[PDB]
Amino acid sequence: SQAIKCVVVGDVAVGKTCLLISYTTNAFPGEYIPTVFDNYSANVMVDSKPVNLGLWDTAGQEDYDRLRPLSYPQTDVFLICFSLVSPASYENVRAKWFPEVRHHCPSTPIILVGTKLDLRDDKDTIEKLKEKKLAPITYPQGLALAKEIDSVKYLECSALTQRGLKTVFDEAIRAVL
Amino acid sequence: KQQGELYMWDSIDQKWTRHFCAIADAKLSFSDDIEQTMEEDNPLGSLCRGILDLNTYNVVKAPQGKNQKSFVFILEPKQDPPVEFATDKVEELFEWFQSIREITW
Numbered sequence: 001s002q003a004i005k006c007v008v009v010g011d012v013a014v015g016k017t018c019l020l021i022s023y024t025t026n027a028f029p030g031e032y033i034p035t036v037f038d039n040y041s042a043n044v045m046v047d048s049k050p051v052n053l054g055l056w057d058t059a060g061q062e063d064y065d066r067l068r069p070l071s072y073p074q075t076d077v078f079l080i081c082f083s084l085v086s087p088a089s090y091e092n093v094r095a096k097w098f099p100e101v102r103h104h105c106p107s108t109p110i111i112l113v114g115t116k117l118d119l120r121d122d123k124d125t126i127e128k129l130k131e132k133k134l135a136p137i138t139y140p141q142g143l144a145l146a147k148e149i150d151s152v153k154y155l156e157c158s159a160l161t162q163r164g165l166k167t168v169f170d171e172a173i174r175a176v177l
Numbered sequence: 178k179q180q181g182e183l184y185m186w187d188s189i190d191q192k193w194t195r196h197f198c199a200i201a202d203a204k205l206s207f208s209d210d211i212e213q214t215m216e217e218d219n220p221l222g223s224l225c226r227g228i229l230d231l232n233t234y235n236v237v238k239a240p241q242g243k244n245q246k247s248f249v250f251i252l253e254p255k256q257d258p259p260v261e262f263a264t265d266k267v268e269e270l271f272e273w274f275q276s277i278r279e280i281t282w
């Protein structure tokens with residue numbers, strides 16, 4: 001089956017846990033429960049290539065900044081996440097997450113992921129966003145952040161609707177074998 | 178390899194108590210109580226009171242703790258009772274949990 005280790009990092013509340021849980025259980029958690037750390041599994045095929053996918057959920061809170069890197073040894077592929085409806089989390093990719101990730105794992109493929117794709121064109125979100133003189137992140141914007149960090153790929157998706165979810169994991173694995 | 182102090186939880190006395198614990202092959206040993214072997218007007222105290230067989234257990238981490246500890250994991254028997262452990266610091270919970278989880282998978 002070939003073990004593949006995958007770690008998911010990114011800002012508080014960008015929807016890392018939902019991504020993992022919705023993909024692994026096709027059920028969307030309504031929770032909301034801040035994460036310390038957590039482990040998950042999937043056995044998948046890909047591309048004819050049976051795999052065993054270890055999934056590591058990390059904490060977004062900086063308080064757990066000492067914990068987080070404990071997950072990084074042996075990692076094969078990273079998912080750096082930001083919410084398409086939260087330019088703070090997008091900026092933090094270049095500020096914190098990609099530097100931290102590269103500090104520890106200089107060589108492992110990264111996969112930039114824009115989350116909450118379903119709120120991108122949401123009336124009620126663009127309203128509150130634009131009340132902070134802000135704007136949802138756009139496909140070309142995400143694409144450009146990918147370039148700066150030389151991520152193997154940029155992918156947008158919604159865990160709640162599942163648009164593009166399978167695809168995030170199916171190129172996370174392809175980035176490995 | 179994996180070794181260190183853990184709190185252990187007594188279902189009967191409803192208290193947590195400190196034990197030096199360690200792992201070898203796939204057996205976890207816990208010592209006697211450290212505070213109580215140290216109050217002892219005697220010296221007694223065993224490093225190995227007893228031994229759990231990790232092969233017959235699964236590790237489970239409590240999402241939000243248990244019994245007024247924040248960082249607790251549980252050895253839930255596959256066959257025996259649960260053994261409930263706890264650390265002071267989350268970085269211990271992590272290390273401990275993974276050792277055993279790698280052993281139980």
Ligand SMILES: Nc1nc2c(ncn2[C@@H]2O[C@H](COP(=O)(O)OP(=O)(O)OP(O)(O)=S)[C@@H](O)[C@H]2O)c(=O)[nH]1
Pocket residue numbers: 010011012013014015016017018019029030031032033034035036058059060061115116117118119157158159160161
């Ligand atoms: N509309 C929509 N909401 C989402 C989506 N993914 C997550 N959310 C919401 O965002 C909230 C936080 O999600 P969560 O997955 O826990 O973020 P997180 O980054 O993992 O949270 P943390 O543990 O690091 S603090 C949840 O209430 C969830 O309902 C999504 O794809 N679409």
Ligand SMILES: [Mg+2]
Pocket residue numbers: 016017034035057058059060
């Ligand atoms: Mg989380």
